Tab-separated table of C-alpha atoms in Angstrom:
chain	number	residue	atom	x	y	z
G	7	UNK	CA	-0.832	12.288	25.369
G	8	UNK	CA	-0.517	8.472	25.745
G	9	UNK	CA	-2.166	5.231	24.690
G	10	UNK	CA	-0.508	1.396	25.416
G	11	UNK	CA	-1.490	-0.997	23.060
G	12	UNK	CA	0.519	-3.625	24.791
G	13	UNK	CA	3.170	-2.693	22.206
G	14	UNK	CA	6.487	-2.653	24.509
G	15	UNK	CA	4.960	-6.464	26.176
G	16	UNK	CA	4.279	-8.150	22.563
G	17	UNK	CA	7.871	-6.895	21.474
G	18	UNK	CA	9.460	-8.162	24.383
G	19	UNK	CA	7.902	-11.121	23.921
G	20	UNK	CA	8.867	-11.217	19.951
G	21	UNK	CA	12.413	-10.106	20.905
G	22	UNK	CA	12.498	-13.515	23.535
G	23	UNK	CA	11.031	-15.947	21.551
G	24	UNK	CA	13.980	-14.981	18.281
G	25	UNK	CA	17.310	-14.896	21.413
G	26	UNK	CA	15.758	-18.210	23.074
G	27	UNK	CA	15.988	-19.482	19.689
G	28	UNK	CA	19.531	-18.196	19.056
G	29	UNK	CA	21.866	-21.109	17.260
G	30	UNK	CA	25.976	-21.226	18.756
G	31	UNK	CA	28.729	-20.103	16.385
G	32	UNK	CA	28.023	-17.710	13.028
G	33	UNK	CA	27.594	-17.917	9.703
G	34	UNK	CA	30.202	-16.626	6.920
G	35	UNK	CA	28.749	-13.937	4.641
G	36	UNK	CA	31.491	-13.441	2.100
G	37	UNK	CA	30.809	-9.984	-0.769
G	38	UNK	CA	31.785	-7.844	-3.141
G	39	UNK	CA	30.413	-4.322	-2.581
G	40	UNK	CA	29.594	-4.574	-6.877
G	41	UNK	CA	28.340	-8.201	-6.720
G	42	UNK	CA	26.453	-7.519	-3.482
G	43	UNK	CA	23.209	-8.941	-4.409
G	44	UNK	CA	24.740	-12.168	-6.724
G	45	UNK	CA	27.398	-13.126	-3.336
G	46	UNK	CA	24.563	-12.678	-0.784
G	47	UNK	CA	22.007	-14.777	-3.040
G	48	UNK	CA	24.344	-17.601	-3.313
G	49	UNK	CA	25.303	-18.202	0.247
G	50	UNK	CA	21.944	-17.520	1.477
G	51	UNK	CA	20.633	-19.983	-0.044
G	52	UNK	CA	23.404	-22.444	0.347
G	53	UNK	CA	22.204	-22.052	3.225
G	54	UNK	CA	19.910	-23.915	5.523
G	55	UNK	CA	17.272	-21.504	6.932
G	56	UNK	CA	18.363	-22.308	10.757
G	57	UNK	CA	21.364	-21.271	10.067
G	58	UNK	CA	20.294	-17.812	9.304
G	59	UNK	CA	19.945	-18.024	13.410
G	60	UNK	CA	23.724	-18.064	13.968
G	61	UNK	CA	25.060	-15.049	14.572
G	62	UNK	CA	26.016	-13.163	11.109
G	63	UNK	CA	29.293	-12.705	9.951
G	64	UNK	CA	30.051	-10.401	6.904
G	65	UNK	CA	33.073	-10.322	4.778
G	66	UNK	CA	33.569	-7.237	2.662
G	67	UNK	CA	36.216	-8.471	0.349
G	68	UNK	CA	39.161	-6.394	-0.117
G	69	UNK	CA	38.435	-4.158	2.797
G	70	UNK	CA	37.943	-3.781	6.205
G	74	UNK	CA	32.195	-4.708	13.895
G	75	UNK	CA	28.308	-5.737	13.284
G	76	UNK	CA	28.491	-3.201	12.791
G	77	UNK	CA	29.001	-3.626	8.283
G	78	UNK	CA	26.313	-6.275	9.199
G	79	UNK	CA	24.499	-3.405	9.387
G	80	UNK	CA	25.890	-1.901	6.591
G	81	UNK	CA	24.796	-5.206	4.468
G	82	UNK	CA	20.988	-5.220	5.794
G	83	UNK	CA	21.127	-1.754	4.567
G	84	UNK	CA	23.276	-2.248	1.374
G	85	UNK	CA	21.103	-5.595	0.488
G	86	UNK	CA	17.708	-3.930	1.748
G	87	UNK	CA	18.085	-1.139	-1.238
G	88	UNK	CA	19.378	-3.504	-4.052
G	89	UNK	CA	17.154	-6.180	-3.824
G	90	UNK	CA	13.602	-4.008	-3.461
G	91	UNK	CA	15.191	-1.850	-6.322
G	92	UNK	CA	12.467	-1.768	-9.158
G	93	UNK	CA	15.873	-1.814	-11.991
G	94	UNK	CA	15.983	-6.208	-10.776
G	95	UNK	CA	11.992	-6.416	-11.827
G	96	UNK	CA	11.234	-8.060	-8.920
G	97	UNK	CA	9.672	-5.481	-6.759
G	98	UNK	CA	7.839	-2.422	-8.028
G	99	UNK	CA	6.933	1.193	-7.270
G	100	UNK	CA	3.447	1.752	-6.239
G	101	UNK	CA	1.877	4.842	-7.089
G	102	UNK	CA	4.550	6.937	-9.287
G	103	UNK	CA	7.394	6.256	-6.100
G	104	UNK	CA	5.622	7.043	-2.922
G	105	UNK	CA	8.903	4.988	-0.497
G	106	UNK	CA	6.261	2.153	-1.390
G	107	UNK	CA	7.339	-1.068	-2.790
G	108	UNK	CA	5.158	-3.875	-4.278
G	109	UNK	CA	5.419	-7.192	-5.976
G	110	UNK	CA	5.826	-6.643	-9.591
G	111	UNK	CA	3.868	-9.199	-12.058
G	112	UNK	CA	6.136	-9.068	-14.753
G	113	UNK	CA	9.064	-10.687	-12.086
G	114	UNK	CA	8.351	-14.228	-14.352
G	115	UNK	CA	10.609	-12.448	-16.798
G	116	UNK	CA	13.177	-14.139	-14.719
G	117	UNK	CA	12.869	-17.559	-14.954
G	118	UNK	CA	14.401	-17.538	-11.096
G	119	UNK	CA	11.951	-15.174	-10.154
G	120	UNK	CA	10.361	-17.363	-7.046
G	121	UNK	CA	14.167	-18.289	-5.751
G	122	UNK	CA	14.372	-14.786	-5.265
G	123	UNK	CA	11.270	-13.881	-3.596
G	124	UNK	CA	12.404	-16.839	-1.804
G	125	UNK	CA	15.572	-15.554	-0.649
G	126	UNK	CA	14.126	-12.204	-0.184
G	127	UNK	CA	12.009	-13.756	2.202
G	128	UNK	CA	14.813	-15.252	4.020
G	129	UNK	CA	16.559	-11.862	4.232
G	130	UNK	CA	13.465	-10.039	5.771
G	131	UNK	CA	12.888	-12.577	8.041
G	132	UNK	CA	16.522	-12.543	9.265
G	133	UNK	CA	16.427	-8.904	9.867
G	134	UNK	CA	13.910	-8.723	12.053
G	135	UNK	CA	15.091	-11.969	14.087
G	136	UNK	CA	18.452	-10.253	14.476
G	137	UNK	CA	16.786	-7.257	15.967
G	138	UNK	CA	18.068	-5.252	12.549
G	139	UNK	CA	15.872	-2.664	11.103
G	140	UNK	CA	15.239	-2.574	7.238
G	141	UNK	CA	14.192	0.445	4.106
G	142	UNK	CA	11.285	-1.540	2.949
G	143	UNK	CA	8.577	0.201	1.287
G	144	UNK	CA	5.737	-2.430	1.781
G	145	UNK	CA	2.234	-1.283	2.558
G	146	UNK	CA	0.410	-2.111	5.190
G	147	UNK	CA	-1.520	-4.491	3.423
G	148	UNK	CA	1.206	-6.553	2.249
G	149	UNK	CA	1.640	-6.435	6.384
G	150	UNK	CA	-1.478	-7.784	6.376
G	151	UNK	CA	-1.256	-10.508	4.284
G	152	UNK	CA	2.039	-11.721	6.231
G	153	UNK	CA	0.003	-11.689	9.466
G	154	UNK	CA	-2.900	-13.636	7.465
G	155	UNK	CA	-5.605	-10.796	8.379
G	156	UNK	CA	-8.286	-9.945	6.479
G	157	UNK	CA	-7.714	-7.509	3.269
G	158	UNK	CA	-10.640	-4.667	3.465
G	159	UNK	CA	-12.015	-2.783	0.165
G	160	UNK	CA	-10.882	0.039	2.121
G	161	UNK	CA	-7.411	-1.625	2.260
G	162	UNK	CA	-7.883	-1.386	-1.512
G	163	UNK	CA	-7.986	1.916	-1.403
G	164	UNK	CA	-4.395	2.192	-0.577
G	165	UNK	CA	-3.594	-0.117	-3.369
G	166	UNK	CA	-5.445	1.107	-6.427
G	167	UNK	CA	-7.573	4.549	-6.485
G	168	UNK	CA	-9.297	4.337	-9.761
G	169	UNK	CA	-10.237	0.569	-9.210
G	170	UNK	CA	-11.504	0.967	-5.692
G	171	UNK	CA	-13.767	4.106	-7.113
G	172	UNK	CA	-14.595	2.374	-9.792
G	173	UNK	CA	-15.992	-0.502	-7.343
G	174	UNK	CA	-17.325	2.194	-5.230
G	175	UNK	CA	-19.245	3.840	-8.499
G	176	UNK	CA	-21.017	-0.197	-9.476
G	177	UNK	CA	-22.045	-0.221	-5.493
G	178	UNK	CA	-23.491	2.968	-5.211
G	179	UNK	CA	-25.181	2.857	-8.628
G	180	UNK	CA	-28.618	0.583	-9.782
G	181	UNK	CA	-26.407	-0.748	-12.842
G	182	UNK	CA	-29.563	-1.993	-14.611
G	183	UNK	CA	-31.036	1.140	-15.179
G	184	UNK	CA	-27.958	2.578	-16.660
G	185	UNK	CA	-28.296	-1.393	-18.672
G	186	UNK	CA	-24.767	-2.152	-17.906
G	187	UNK	CA	-23.104	-5.889	-18.728
G	188	UNK	CA	-20.998	-7.376	-16.847
G	189	UNK	CA	-19.602	-10.563	-15.853
G	190	UNK	CA	-18.025	-12.792	-13.076
G	191	UNK	CA	-14.951	-13.116	-14.837
G	192	UNK	CA	-11.662	-10.986	-14.923
G	193	UNK	CA	-8.706	-10.965	-17.323
G	194	UNK	CA	-5.195	-9.904	-16.754
G	195	UNK	CA	-2.184	-9.056	-18.864
G	196	UNK	CA	1.146	-9.619	-18.328
G	197	UNK	CA	3.938	-9.183	-20.427
G	198	UNK	CA	1.481	-9.570	-23.350
G	199	UNK	CA	-0.120	-12.962	-22.295
G	200	UNK	CA	-3.534	-12.685	-21.216
G	201	UNK	CA	-5.243	-14.719	-18.934
G	202	UNK	CA	-8.558	-15.458	-18.164
G	203	UNK	CA	-9.997	-16.246	-14.194
G	204	UNK	CA	-13.664	-16.740	-13.172
G	205	UNK	CA	-14.082	-15.450	-9.768
G	206	UNK	CA	-17.416	-18.539	-9.502
G	207	UNK	CA	-17.472	-21.638	-11.162
G	208	UNK	CA	-18.281	-20.806	-14.926
G	209	UNK	CA	-18.263	-17.240	-14.327
G	210	UNK	CA	-19.418	-16.028	-17.578
G	211	UNK	CA	-22.397	-15.122	-15.518
G	212	UNK	CA	-23.821	-11.240	-16.123
G	213	UNK	CA	-23.739	-8.998	-12.737
G	214	UNK	CA	-26.337	-7.612	-11.454
G	215	UNK	CA	-28.030	-5.108	-9.427
G	216	UNK	CA	-28.775	-7.871	-6.796
G	217	UNK	CA	-27.461	-9.404	-4.938
G	218	UNK	CA	-24.503	-10.487	-7.005
G	219	UNK	CA	-22.973	-6.994	-7.355
G	220	UNK	CA	-22.030	-6.900	-3.634
G	221	UNK	CA	-20.490	-10.396	-3.973
G	222	UNK	CA	-18.439	-9.415	-7.561
G	223	UNK	CA	-17.191	-6.057	-5.397
G	224	UNK	CA	-16.366	-8.164	-2.973
G	225	UNK	CA	-14.460	-11.231	-5.599
G	226	UNK	CA	-13.190	-7.859	-7.248
G	227	UNK	CA	-11.274	-6.979	-4.292
G	228	UNK	CA	-10.117	-9.750	-2.738
G	229	UNK	CA	-8.700	-10.937	-6.905
G	230	UNK	CA	-7.233	-7.596	-7.278
G	231	UNK	CA	-4.711	-7.829	-3.874
G	232	UNK	CA	-2.987	-10.886	-5.354
G	233	UNK	CA	-3.144	-9.912	-9.044
G	234	UNK	CA	-0.115	-11.484	-11.262
G	235	UNK	CA	1.585	-12.136	-7.745
G	236	UNK	CA	0.418	-15.284	-6.225
G	237	UNK	CA	3.249	-16.970	-6.859
G	238	UNK	CA	5.782	-14.488	-5.932
G	239	UNK	CA	3.729	-14.177	-2.600
G	240	UNK	CA	3.893	-17.579	-1.586
G	241	UNK	CA	7.374	-17.835	-2.240
G	242	UNK	CA	8.150	-14.955	-0.035
G	243	UNK	CA	5.927	-15.952	2.399
G	244	UNK	CA	7.497	-19.299	2.672
G	245	UNK	CA	11.262	-18.359	2.798
G	246	UNK	CA	10.067	-16.138	5.396
G	247	UNK	CA	8.752	-18.624	7.555
G	248	UNK	CA	11.648	-20.982	7.204
G	249	UNK	CA	13.678	-18.395	9.075
G	250	UNK	CA	10.886	-16.606	11.413
G	251	UNK	CA	7.690	-18.307	11.997
G	252	UNK	CA	4.913	-16.276	10.750
G	253	UNK	CA	3.234	-17.865	13.627
G	254	UNK	CA	5.276	-15.260	16.104
G	255	UNK	CA	4.526	-12.283	14.156
G	256	UNK	CA	0.386	-13.299	15.789
G	257	UNK	CA	1.619	-10.615	18.719
G	258	UNK	CA	1.251	-7.877	16.266
G	259	UNK	CA	-1.081	-5.469	13.898
G	260	UNK	CA	0.498	-4.164	10.551
G	261	UNK	CA	1.218	-1.174	11.695
G	262	UNK	CA	3.126	-2.278	15.156
G	263	UNK	CA	4.780	-5.024	12.326
G	264	UNK	CA	6.183	-1.962	10.519
G	265	UNK	CA	7.677	-0.298	13.152
G	266	UNK	CA	9.167	-3.700	14.173
G	267	UNK	CA	10.649	-3.668	10.626
G	268	UNK	CA	11.761	-0.256	9.863
G	269	UNK	CA	11.813	1.036	12.840
G	270	UNK	CA	11.176	4.180	15.198
G	271	UNK	CA	11.340	7.311	13.587
G	272	UNK	CA	11.233	10.794	15.066
G	273	UNK	CA	8.663	13.424	14.243
G	274	UNK	CA	9.744	16.658	14.391
G	275	UNK	CA	6.435	19.311	14.742
G	276	UNK	CA	7.408	22.319	13.369
G	277	UNK	CA	8.118	20.321	9.355
G	278	UNK	CA	4.571	18.572	10.254
G	279	UNK	CA	2.497	21.679	10.469
G	280	UNK	CA	4.336	23.669	8.377
G	281	UNK	CA	4.131	21.640	5.335
G	282	UNK	CA	0.310	20.704	6.112
G	283	UNK	CA	-2.783	21.666	3.805
G	284	UNK	CA	-6.166	22.375	4.732
G	285	UNK	CA	-9.428	21.937	2.476
G	286	UNK	CA	-12.469	23.384	4.070
G	287	UNK	CA	-10.366	24.226	7.272
G	288	UNK	CA	-7.462	26.576	7.516
G	289	UNK	CA	-4.824	26.864	10.446
G	290	UNK	CA	-7.474	29.252	12.144
G	291	UNK	CA	-10.290	26.802	12.359
G	292	UNK	CA	-10.382	25.896	15.661
G	293	UNK	CA	-10.396	22.233	15.250
G	294	UNK	CA	-6.959	22.401	13.371
G	295	UNK	CA	-5.658	24.223	16.099
G	296	UNK	CA	-6.890	21.608	18.123
G	297	UNK	CA	-5.304	19.169	15.642
G	298	UNK	CA	-1.726	21.076	16.238
G	299	UNK	CA	-2.182	21.117	20.326
G	300	UNK	CA	-2.831	17.542	19.957
G	301	UNK	CA	0.195	16.592	18.045
G	302	UNK	CA	2.297	18.703	20.095
G	303	UNK	CA	1.051	17.139	23.835
G	304	UNK	CA	1.230	13.422	22.085
G	305	UNK	CA	4.612	10.824	22.167
G	306	UNK	CA	6.091	10.009	18.863
G	307	UNK	CA	4.855	6.287	19.309
G	308	UNK	CA	1.457	7.946	19.188
G	309	UNK	CA	2.516	10.316	16.676
G	310	UNK	CA	3.876	7.345	14.551
G	311	UNK	CA	0.452	5.617	14.740
G	312	UNK	CA	-1.196	8.696	13.206
G	313	UNK	CA	1.615	8.654	10.462
G	314	UNK	CA	0.491	5.713	9.752
G	315	UNK	CA	-2.923	6.212	9.644
G	316	UNK	CA	-2.861	9.066	7.336
G	317	UNK	CA	-0.167	8.395	4.833
G	318	UNK	CA	0.018	4.546	5.214
G	319	UNK	CA	3.633	4.459	6.773
G	320	UNK	CA	6.053	5.476	9.786
G	321	UNK	CA	8.698	6.019	7.855
G	322	UNK	CA	9.277	9.726	6.703
G	323	UNK	CA	10.924	10.979	3.328
G	324	UNK	CA	14.333	11.934	3.147
G	325	UNK	CA	13.568	15.989	3.291
G	326	UNK	CA	11.130	15.733	5.772
G	327	UNK	CA	6.977	16.399	4.992
G	328	UNK	CA	7.559	19.173	2.435
G	329	UNK	CA	8.699	16.160	0.096
G	330	UNK	CA	5.499	13.615	0.955
G	331	UNK	CA	4.421	11.741	-1.635
G	332	UNK	CA	0.500	10.356	-2.702
G	333	UNK	CA	0.181	7.674	-4.788
G	334	UNK	CA	-0.355	10.334	-7.835
G	335	UNK	CA	2.710	12.446	-6.907
G	336	UNK	CA	4.136	14.829	-4.582
G	337	UNK	CA	1.101	15.502	-1.940
G	338	UNK	CA	1.496	17.070	1.480
G	339	UNK	CA	-0.050	16.085	4.611
G	340	UNK	CA	-4.102	17.594	4.318
G	341	UNK	CA	-7.129	17.923	6.606
G	342	UNK	CA	-10.195	18.149	5.173
G	343	UNK	CA	-13.528	18.403	6.960
G	344	UNK	CA	-16.172	16.524	6.562
G	345	UNK	CA	-19.483	15.180	8.038
G	346	UNK	CA	-20.740	16.081	11.689
G	347	UNK	CA	-19.655	15.963	15.483
G	348	UNK	CA	-20.807	12.678	15.569
G	349	UNK	CA	-18.318	10.880	12.970
G	350	UNK	CA	-15.347	8.910	13.264
G	351	UNK	CA	-11.908	10.083	11.742
G	352	UNK	CA	-11.380	8.841	8.312
G	353	UNK	CA	-8.268	8.480	5.914
G	354	UNK	CA	-6.846	8.227	2.429
G	355	UNK	CA	-3.473	7.149	2.676
G	356	UNK	CA	-3.196	7.185	-1.108
G	357	UNK	CA	-3.633	11.029	-1.237
G	358	UNK	CA	-2.199	12.203	2.798
G	359	UNK	CA	-5.470	12.706	3.865
G	360	UNK	CA	-7.487	12.770	7.041
G	361	UNK	CA	-10.700	13.844	7.104
G	362	UNK	CA	-11.530	15.525	10.479
G	363	UNK	CA	-15.065	15.879	11.785
G	364	UNK	CA	-16.012	19.269	13.077
G	365	UNK	CA	-15.531	18.483	16.958
G	366	UNK	CA	-17.309	20.941	19.118
G	367	UNK	CA	-13.975	20.363	21.999
G	368	UNK	CA	-10.775	19.903	22.027
G	369	UNK	CA	-11.266	16.763	24.338
G	370	UNK	CA	-13.766	15.382	21.614
G	371	UNK	CA	-11.117	15.977	19.034
G	372	UNK	CA	-8.665	14.076	21.169
G	373	UNK	CA	-11.016	11.080	21.965
G	374	UNK	CA	-12.087	10.608	18.634
G	375	UNK	CA	-9.056	10.985	16.814
G	376	UNK	CA	-7.084	8.736	20.011
G	377	UNK	CA	-9.888	5.890	19.050
G	378	UNK	CA	-9.621	6.214	14.933
G	379	UNK	CA	-5.802	5.697	15.018
G	380	UNK	CA	-5.325	3.239	17.767
G	381	UNK	CA	-8.474	0.912	16.941
G	382	UNK	CA	-8.865	1.107	12.634
G	383	UNK	CA	-7.875	0.327	10.104
B	6	UNK	CA	-1.878	14.640	-23.245
B	7	UNK	CA	-2.498	10.955	-22.667
B	8	UNK	CA	-5.028	9.258	-20.710
B	9	UNK	CA	-5.939	5.000	-19.956
B	10	UNK	CA	-9.388	4.126	-20.014
B	11	UNK	CA	-9.688	0.625	-18.027
B	12	UNK	CA	-12.004	-1.760	-17.536
B	13	UNK	CA	-13.116	-4.332	-14.733
B	14	UNK	CA	-13.220	-6.900	-17.037
B	15	UNK	CA	-9.099	-6.091	-17.257
B	16	UNK	CA	-8.543	-5.279	-20.785
B	17	UNK	CA	-7.161	-1.501	-21.208
B	18	UNK	CA	-6.260	1.164	-23.553
B	19	UNK	CA	-4.284	4.266	-24.283
B	20	UNK	CA	-5.796	7.173	-25.490
B	21	UNK	CA	-4.422	10.310	-26.606
B	22	UNK	CA	-6.621	13.714	-25.728
B	23	UNK	CA	-6.815	16.767	-25.669
B	24	UNK	CA	-7.909	18.673	-22.295
B	25	UNK	CA	-10.312	20.339	-24.416
B	26	UNK	CA	-11.794	17.323	-25.935
B	27	UNK	CA	-15.678	16.489	-25.094
B	28	UNK	CA	-16.607	12.566	-23.370
B	29	UNK	CA	-18.016	12.364	-26.727
B	30	UNK	CA	-15.330	12.719	-28.884
B	31	UNK	CA	-13.543	10.659	-26.193
B	32	UNK	CA	-16.390	8.012	-26.525
B	33	UNK	CA	-15.824	8.893	-30.465
B	34	UNK	CA	-11.917	7.885	-30.013
B	35	UNK	CA	-12.670	4.852	-28.032
B	36	UNK	CA	-15.040	3.607	-31.371
B	37	UNK	CA	-12.071	4.925	-33.841
B	38	UNK	CA	-9.939	2.315	-32.000
B	39	UNK	CA	-12.365	-0.662	-30.360
B	40	UNK	CA	-15.225	-0.804	-32.323
B	41	UNK	CA	-17.126	-0.352	-30.171
B	42	UNK	CA	-19.980	2.425	-30.591
B	43	UNK	CA	-20.602	5.474	-28.156
B	44	UNK	CA	-24.313	4.827	-27.296
B	45	UNK	CA	-22.783	1.685	-25.047
B	46	UNK	CA	-20.170	3.232	-23.512
B	47	UNK	CA	-20.268	4.927	-19.650
B	48	UNK	CA	-17.553	6.179	-18.847
B	49	UNK	CA	-16.958	7.616	-15.011
B	50	UNK	CA	-13.549	9.196	-13.171
B	51	UNK	CA	-13.385	9.143	-9.405
B	52	UNK	CA	-16.508	7.314	-8.567
B	53	UNK	CA	-18.650	10.444	-10.899
B	54	UNK	CA	-20.262	9.363	-14.625
B	55	UNK	CA	-19.836	11.311	-17.342
B	56	UNK	CA	-21.596	13.162	-19.585
B	57	UNK	CA	-21.571	14.069	-22.652
B	58	UNK	CA	-20.932	17.837	-23.084
B	59	UNK	CA	-18.792	18.396	-20.538
B	60	UNK	CA	-14.977	18.267	-21.220
B	61	UNK	CA	-11.652	16.126	-19.815
B	62	UNK	CA	-11.430	19.788	-17.749
B	63	UNK	CA	-14.599	19.928	-16.305
B	64	UNK	CA	-12.966	17.215	-14.579
B	65	UNK	CA	-9.444	17.701	-13.612
B	66	UNK	CA	-8.360	14.766	-15.957
B	67	UNK	CA	-5.177	15.022	-16.841
B	68	UNK	CA	-1.927	13.424	-17.976
B	69	UNK	CA	-2.216	9.502	-17.236
B	70	UNK	CA	-5.544	10.145	-15.534
B	71	UNK	CA	-7.577	6.773	-15.500
B	72	UNK	CA	-10.795	6.339	-16.667
B	73	UNK	CA	-12.931	3.687	-16.311
B	74	UNK	CA	-15.485	2.437	-19.241
B	75	UNK	CA	-18.377	0.305	-18.637
B	76	UNK	CA	-20.293	-1.314	-21.448
B	77	UNK	CA	-24.231	-1.297	-22.173
B	78	UNK	CA	-26.425	-4.675	-22.895
């Protein structure tokens, strides 16, 4: 089983853009192993952005291959995205998922650091070096200026999402709810108010501003307390790799571009998958693992991204799969009818697999869902 | 066991509770801390409205579970 999205075509064109705009000579990066973040910050920020397109020449002081350019990209990526430094924070518990911290304002120069992180990530992509970022697919969708959706929201804040769904489905007027088009935000003990609409203390009614309310809350939640940080990141990035160059890609392709391919082991996956309203003896589950068997690694990764929200596997295999609520193994649940398309909840690493009537039907439906969605 | 009670308005509280506690107990603690009469409160968890009489255990509300509170006019 294969499926071409034109990904090879996209990758080849993106790489050609980078290489055909390479600049001569080099940039020298002189750092200490124990002062890597600060040394790299200072030196990279003192350089012009286009210098970063020169070949890269890294020196670890007191030691002695790019090569250790690779070591630098590795070590520095893990340091700048370490929640220890208040710029990024783990999403839900951990999940190997990282997002911008609203309390980054704790450091008055946080925007200078986000500019540098933007440059640094762009540098990695430009030079074809892979990074272990934990950026979510909605973060990548933002880099691509793609519409963020309410399913995107479920991936970011499950209970917030669930509350908006409850509003959506229930008659709020019969319940007698009092809600207004305004939202407060507390960061580091400071409260700031935001009207979602001009003069937003202005009541939510069953309809049809509750739909309008829900969409405004959705859009507001994605950038909650991180607008300036996100702009600083994107601006720094754009200085090195124009964001427009990324428009070959969707958010899942971008994730692969940046973080690299992983070999997905079938045996490890099957052994660590749990079921709801299915067992390993359900014919849909047997078909599922037959599907996974026939398919190449690129389709496996795209299936992983669909269900878990990332192509990247935890150290320790599928047995150590995290969900936004703590450790949660890959899960497949029976829902709906053979008519339905497959769906997923990335926060729970959960595939909703309808009870399809044949192997071929399952193959066709699932391939459509993982290749033409989110 | 702690549970957060959050609002779409944006304010939040933390409550110390017992898995054995009923929803009407929860709404009482909310009245204690917040001054909101339980008659005006509506609690939800995972898209489900919570009824007084049921316990926090009937829903698998656990440690650092987040309820959402809605207020009545």
